[PDB]
């Protein structure tokens, strides 16, 4: 079910991670001017509620472990967009808006 879907989702993030690693100015600017931010917000929203639900069931722990490493693949992609970051950078500022919009889900993630 979600096990095969999350496996594909990791590779989508890993490919996105690979494009910007070894800082490429063009690719970072292209991804900044893209619908990736809303795609992250939806994934963050899914990450928030599903972690709470999956933690209750002891037989569904294996799904949570696969879910957890998927979130690790996302944050690496976000940490790669900050390569070559400058003060008040466009890519940095656009990420701040994305965190603000999904601030409700992040609080549960930290919790």
Swiss-Prot record:
Domain of life of the native organism: Eukaryota
Binding site for Ca(2+): 18
Signal sequence segment: none
Free-text tissue specificity from the UniProt record: Detected in skeletal muscle (at protein level). Fast- or slow-twitch skeletal muscle.
Localization (cell): Sarcoplasmic reticulum membrane
Modifications after synthesis and translation: The N-terminus is blocked. Channel activity is modulated by phosphorylation.
Function according to Swiss-Prot or TrEMBL: Cytosolic calcium-activated calcium channel that mediates the release of Ca(2+) from the sarcoplasmic reticulum into the cytosol and thereby plays a key role in triggering muscle contraction following depolarization of T-tubules. Repeated very high-level exercise increases the open probability of the channel and leads to Ca(2+) leaking into the cytoplasm. Can also mediate the release of Ca(2+) from intracellular stores in neurons, and may thereby promote prolonged Ca(2+) signaling in the brain. Required for normal embryonic development of muscle fibers and skeletal muscle.
Subunit structure: Homotetramer. Can also form heterotetramers with RYR2. Identified in a complex composed of RYR1, PDE4D, PKA, FKBP1A and protein phosphatase 1 (PP1). Repeated very high-level exercise decreases interaction with PDE4D and protein phosphatase 1 (PP1). Interacts with CALM; CALM with bound calcium inhibits the RYR1 channel activity. Interacts with S100A1. Interacts with FKBP1A; this stabilizes the closed conformation of the channel. Interacts with CACNA1S; interaction with CACNA1S is important for activation of the RYR1 channel. Interacts with CACNB1.
Family according to the record: Belongs to the ryanodine receptor (TC 1.A.3.1) family. RYR1 subfamily.
Note: Binding of [3H]ryanodine indicates that the heterozygous channel is activated by Ca(2+) concentrations 4-fold lower than normal. Single-cell analysis of cotransfected cells shows a significantly increased resting cytoplasmic Ca(2+) level and a significantly reduced luminal Ca(2+) level.
UniProt free text on domains: The calcium release channel activity resides in the C-terminal region while the remaining part of the protein constitutes the 'foot' structure spanning the junctional gap between the sarcoplasmic reticulum (SR) and the T-tubule. Pore opening is mediated via the cytoplasmic calcium-binding domains that mediate a small rotation of the channel-forming transmembrane regions that then leads to channel opening.
Name of the protein described by the UniProt record: Ryanodine receptor 1
Source species: Oryctolagus cuniculus (Rabbit)
GN (gene name): RYR1
Segment of the intact protein contained: 3950 to 4060 of 5037
